[model samples]
Target chain A: KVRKAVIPAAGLGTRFLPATKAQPKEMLPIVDKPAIQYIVEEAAESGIEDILIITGRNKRSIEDHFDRSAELEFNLREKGKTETLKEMQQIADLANIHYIRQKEPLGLGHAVLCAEHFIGDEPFAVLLGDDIMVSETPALRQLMDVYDVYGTEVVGVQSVLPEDVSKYGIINTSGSQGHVYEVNDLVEKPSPEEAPSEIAVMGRYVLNSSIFSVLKTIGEIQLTDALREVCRKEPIHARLLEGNRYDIGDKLGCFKASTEIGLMRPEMRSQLLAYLEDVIKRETKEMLR
Target chain B: RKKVRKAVIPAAGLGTRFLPATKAQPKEMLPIVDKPAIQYIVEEAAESGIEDILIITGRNKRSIEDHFDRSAELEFNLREKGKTETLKEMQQIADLANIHYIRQKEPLGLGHAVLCAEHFIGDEPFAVLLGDDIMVSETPALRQLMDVYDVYGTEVVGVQSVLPEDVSKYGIINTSGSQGHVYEVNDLVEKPSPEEAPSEIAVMGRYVLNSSIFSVLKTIGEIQLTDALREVCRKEPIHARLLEGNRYDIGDKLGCFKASTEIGLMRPEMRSQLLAYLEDVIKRETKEMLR
Candidate 1:
């Protein structure tokens, strides 16, 4: 069982731009809750009781969000906003979440290395805040199943569109049965014509203790580069992610996640549908005129 | 009640409260739903029967000007695609009003921004709207003040009763007397604490000011609209009306989020989808809470 998880949140999120300029992109509101909340929830649901989040400057809000707010709790309790009060308490109690600073502006692999002490010698899970997975079986738990059976490193992947293949690390599988595949090799952001396969890594990983040593040997400290090395040395498998992976790092992906997740709520469904119908009807009328 | 034929929107303030979002774009360009926050203000002014509108903008506010201007290439693409409704909507935004824009060269105070409109105001009464504050109502909120201006033939300021704790965050007005929702303004204080505030009636950044106020604006130092109003109130009667609508300060992050959600709920096309998603959010949250 992967009891420990490392979430590398140190990236400055340059692509997200001004929204991520002051606040961490992970804290950007998806709907009601920030993006990171969904990520941490996924970990908790997947049975990750311990989490170490690698952060940088101006990332204090990440810690602040998971901590208790006595004044807010007192006010919510007094006001009898029980539902909101419960939600607040749930976030704080999700996991034994800890944070450590990444001293330098390093890549993803380096960010994970900082958690070496926290992770100990056991296998651990690594969840990127940028990728949010929504499924009945948690995405991490899906990968954990592969790890449980194979007793090796399992990379979570999903089939991305041809046009979007260049956005992620695509894997070449040597053999496959059902949904699991033996990852023969991996290529990062290769063009569609140059890509080995459409199955791209969607930022979920069940890594063994050996990953730390491989990461230490890398020069550039890229997780993908380290994974490429691991693939050559030992057997690492790729499991197709069971759920929809929302890329929060992309602008369009962020909006899609917000709307899709918002639709999952039953309370506002019918009213929202009626509103949409009226809007479409009005637009149609305008088009006819 | 002299006819207020024009409005001046002061959109030059640096949106530091909404940093990263406002870092690259003008705060006025921040969308409430599909439309930018400033578009709502412009539409409100037009609905209030203002003939000419002046937007005093600052640096990096070119987007505001572009949004109000017609896009030939975009229109062509929409027309070619036979998106008649979208094309019409796009055209309507450009022709919302006889909109005019003037650049404020410096990061001056609101008073200075309004003073920039003296030449346009001439001798007629004009309206001033802070771009960050948006009001939603059946009768346009700005028009409500204009109606009071017509009956009283005096300067009118749109005021709303905020929470006791929020009184410190606004320009609190001391009322001398009240008739209906209109109050005779005795004094106007800038951001007074709840203990020292005259009343909970805080200015909501919509105003019908006479040309005479321009003289006081010219003689200002701190250049705050409140200070100028206080100076103007000493000489003539200034009326504050409790607005018949919700006021949203979209310059702040929470206010921006609130505006986007409510406005989306208000739109016919967006309501159902937004509502459904909101329901899902609650259901999902409740489940997550349980988990």
Candidate 2:
């Protein structure tokens, strides 16, 4: 069983502009918790207890957010503010979390490589900071299931439109066993016209520690590039992610995620519906007038 | 009291505390529920009958200005789609008031920011709303202060007794005497310790300052609004009234989170589920409540 997960969080999140200028995009609040919290929770749900968060400069807030606050805890205890107090205490206790900074602005592969020693020779899981998965059941757990059966290099994937296929890493195989496929071939950002398949690599992955050697040979390493090398040599596989995946790195995806997840709440569904109905009616009034 | 007609909201301060979120986004534009935080402030001003407003802004505050200005293209798109209903609500934001803006060239201080409005304010008195403190009041928090200003014919400072732990976070005021909720203010100290506090009532950001305070702010040069208010208090009569409302301080991260939660909890659509989620989270975290 893969008990350790690595989430590379060093990207500058340039797409979000000023919001991510001084803050890590992962810290952006989702409904109540930051987006990164959801990733951590997903790992915990999948039975991964040891997590290594690869970070960079100006990312102290993430560390601080998960770290304890004795003063605040004491103050909360004194005031009987148990709800918030417990939330803070729980965040600090999520896992046996460790952190190591990626000193250079290397690519994602390099960030993961920084954790090579900690990873040892055991299989491990990787989650990207930008992708948030909202599922009825834990999404990563499904990928772990693929690992349990085959113990191969497993990459989470989803199908994209013909027009969008070029925007992702598409695997060659067309069919599946319970949505898991033998990833016999793969290409990153292949031209829409050149695409051989519709399936695209998603954010989660279960990889054999053996890929570390494959990554070492590549220069300016992208995690995808390493995966490409492994797909050709190792017994790699792909699993279509269960549930919706929101690319929160972009603004539209972030808002869509907000609306979808928001609607799942008790009153937000009706309230948002009424708000939209009101907006539609209000904006349509002049047309009738 | 004498038909107060204007307000100045200082929104120029770099939202350093909110980092990253504030790195590019103006704190005033941060969303609470569906509306940006500043809309509540403007709505409060509208309800209080204040028509002309001056937003004292600084560099990178174009977003705040754009938010208040009408969007012709947006309106056209909405109209083209026959969404005239929500179009009004959306455009009405830009059409809310006779809102004007001025730039604070320097990050001097709040006192300096207020003085920037002197030309428009002229000789008439005005209310200064701090975009940071949002009040949920039945009677309208600003309206409450204006009513007291009407009765006293003196300056007004809105106040609420802060928790002892929060005493040092605000400007503490001492009451010389009182009539109903209005306190005859004798002294004002900036961020005093709990032990050294003059009283429990901290002067919140809402205030109706007479034009004379402008002359006082000008003389203090680079002083805090608290310092200027303290300076103004010595020469002119300044009254404090305990506000009748729930006040949320949006100056810090925790305050913003609390504002969102408290406000969200009140919405009929989300209340039951939000409360249920909160209980579940608490129980799951502590294993204390659910059992």
Candidate 3:
């Protein structure tokens, strides 16, 4: 039933350093909510009741955010801000969440390995903290739906440009219908000309317990390598992520997500648009002088 | 205008609202589009014809001073590479004003920070602008306050009417009456509730204080600007000038985002492209929601 989810959030997001020097990148807000909160909500909404967040040093804020703050609640309630109070209370009640610190900055596969005890003998979901996917059907749930049908691994992927294919793990797909692809093999950062297909893995995964055995065999580990080995032994499907994916780890991506997600909210939409239009008009008029 | 030739920028606040970003770099150093935020404040003071400036700072605020100082090596490289346009811009930032700095050395509030600038201000009326608020107008915000100070020959505070719910977020001014945009501030209350507020006129971050404020500051041990201003208001006249401009509080998260976005839109080369992208993105997102 894919009831457990592992979020590997231990990486030092160096791309967002200075802002991320003391603060974990995951805690950086998209609009109002932190980036990791969106990922956790997706897992919870997709029916993942048990979530084990793999963290490292300086990531304690992430824990505090998901835990209830009695003082803050009292303050909010006393001020009669019931709306904000409800949202604050809901954060701590999102799911049965747990945490474990990765002792060192090992690769993502090692981060996943830390969750082995929590995910013992179960088909689990692995959601990356950096990639925030906005979709009607939760991105993880789409993959889990495929996992239910195929009873094998499912990796979430999206089509990239031919020139950008080398930037990701491009999958060698035997066939794809509509949104699902039968992934034959995967290559890490292959040249565009040598690439089998343009579909690139975008950091959402549903894997059976066999992946643990494959992941432990590697010395310096990455989940991509294990996924490739597993696909060779048995078929795995790749679901084309139906909605937008923002890589908030990068500065531009973070701004992009902030803008687009802000536009989606009803309260912020008209005011933001009016401000944008007013600034553009004012500037354009001044430019003519 | 009054000879308010000197300015004090109180940048000593611990910008806890803007964490992580302000962890290593001072919040004043955050970029509004291509330029650092504090540079805009400095440029505004320079444009307002303020000749001398003192920045009251705290720990981890060295970068603010460094950003305004001459970067000889960087300029030399730019000059050697024939990057005249870029070099000109870099040199102009260093030459903005006669900028000096003094460290607050503690977490005292704005009133204490302003007192640190007393020696620099001397006996003349001086302008104090908070780096938290950036005011945009045809006439620089500080200049607008200086005009009010010139007419009334009293303390001048830049103010704007805030929303009802937002009265608790700012220092609300009690006004007795007004002539045009200028109001006689009878009293100043720091962050009053909607019911407790006398009026909606909230004190924005620009203030042109008479030198007499120093005496009032010395009398009070409370380290808040609102308290000092309230005391001064009781003793003498303080005019609240309704600032005609857009105001952004860069101290908070949403305000920082809005300032960056709006300021980025003001760049001529980037304006059309950014507008088109924003229009296209909003439309695309709305359409996707329907599907």
Candidate 4:
């Protein structure tokens, strides 16, 4: 029964500067909608009634983007632009969206700490706004199922490329079947050679509120450190969820994900796939030379 | 009579101003909003009833070809996602026109690039639109030039009068009289000094060129298209039509910024925000002068 979800979008996206200079990186468009909107939509689909957005400075646009634009909506309705009006209204109706500003530039751990008051005693889901998971099962919903079974902390894991393991938190698993797993340990951004397993813990998590006490004991707060403490204290579990996670922070990854998703569109699929095949053929030929 | 159905875009120049961004990508591929600059140019050509587009490209410009090709996977994915509207926009771009590419092997000049397309162009009077200049008008720049060509039955260069100092930077045309938008060309001077400029009227990037000009271009020893156009003017008559609309020269940084600013101000999402920012900038500059 997940009622609320916390989205941590406080980190400064330095890699995507100039474009993200005045705008929040979470607000960058994947196709037509901003990245944050996708996360919010996912939470809504997972049956989360309320969304707690932990934001930083310059993220006001993200808040305003989801809020009801009364004047614009009225004008669009008057002009008989019902489609545009409905789209604007949908953003406002998505969830009971709330915002908490994280004043200082900090790590992911500190950003999540800002949402402690919002969670109170209820179990809540934490989703990193940057990690956009596209799945039929709804990645958060899958994790919630695992959380209900174990009634403890559950983290999402996915198999990543060996070389890319260093970029993510590697999870050591003892048992796994049908989306649920027994987690032995967790290492944050470990080297490929030293990684416990190829399964890396992504940003999706369902944590017991007791974890907040562990987070407090950890002091100089990092989200992973607190999660590690939860593992030590309780029956913490990890689930290798089924989905394609698109981290739009990397330029090539962003292009690949956009190209893949763009190719999936009905009107664009035939033409875009043909274009992509030609691009791939040309690239292969160029590489051979 | 089939529609005057083909377009030739000359994109062979080494865009020296844009450096590294152009080193990997063609300068024409630089995006304006979500679509590339060349995409907008090609869209304009398609909208003006052109079916076939001959892109005169150079080395490392495969992206242009890829952009015009069809995608099967993308159409499938769009269907899966149920995004009918977005899928439609992609189909529109892919279905805009049939595109062909010809490589300009050497960096000779614009004339040589145009001459490379003679085999495909055959003997039809076709359009030659420079990708660097983007015209935002009710009707496209080439359509306006074609309208003048239809009335006069002659080769017409799109022309607009520039400032006195700016005349030297373009091919200046001396006109006999301005009857409506059409003008009778007295003579043409290529990049003349302000003192030597025939008139303030400067040639823009759009042209409704006659096929006979190709022979003149082939005979020229140097790579200048102006020399061939001059020869055509000598043999027959060449006219200059002063086009009515604002033209954006995207080749220069300042001009690109100006175009971006204007276009940004026109968008519903950014218009009010951009206007307020511009107002503040203007006020700040005024206050600094007063202090």
Worst 10 residues of 1 chain A by lDDT: A14-23
Task: Go through the candidates in order and give each one's C-alpha lDDT.
Answer: 0.77, 0.76, 0.79, 0.72
Scored by DockQ, the top model is 3
Candidate 3 local lDDT, B1-291, one digit each (tens)? 448899998887645455333333456766565466788888889999999999888764666776676656455646777878766776677789999999987657789888888888879999988877777799998889899888888888989998899999889888889999899998989998799999989888889987888988988874898888888877775898999998877766667778877765667866666667666765675687699
Which DockQ value does candidate 4 get? 0.02
Q: What does TM-score give for chain A of every model?
A: 0.94, 0.93, 0.96, 0.91
TM-score preference between candidates 2 and 4, better one: 2
Evaluated at residue A229, the lDDT of candidate 2 is: 77
Lowest summed lDDT over 10 consecutive residues: which window, candidate 2 chain B? B280-289
Give the higher-DockQ candidate: 2 or 3: 3
Q: List the lowest-lDDT window of 10 residues for candidate 4 chain B.
A: B16-25
Relative to the true structure, candidate 2 reaches a TM of: 0.59
Q: Which stretches of candidate 4 lie over 4 Å from their true place?
A: A277-289, B1-291
Candidate 2 lDDT by residue in tens digits, B109-176:
78888889999988887899887778888988888889888888778898989788888988888887
Off by over 4 Å in 3: A177-179, B1-132, B135-202, B207-227, B237-246, B250-256, B266-276, B282-291
Ordering by DockQ: 3, 2, 1, 4
- Preferred candidate (TM-score higher): 1 or 4: 1
- Over the true interface residues, superposed, what is the Cα RMSD of model 2? 11.4
Model 3, DockQ value? 0.07
What shift in Å separates residue A266 of candidate 1 from its native position after superposition? 1.0
* Candidate 4 lDDT score at position A94: 88
**Is 1 or 3 the stronger prediction by TM-score?**
3
Q: Taking the tens digit of each residue's C-alpha lDDT, what string does model 4 give over B112-161? A: 88898788878787888887677778887788888887777677898888
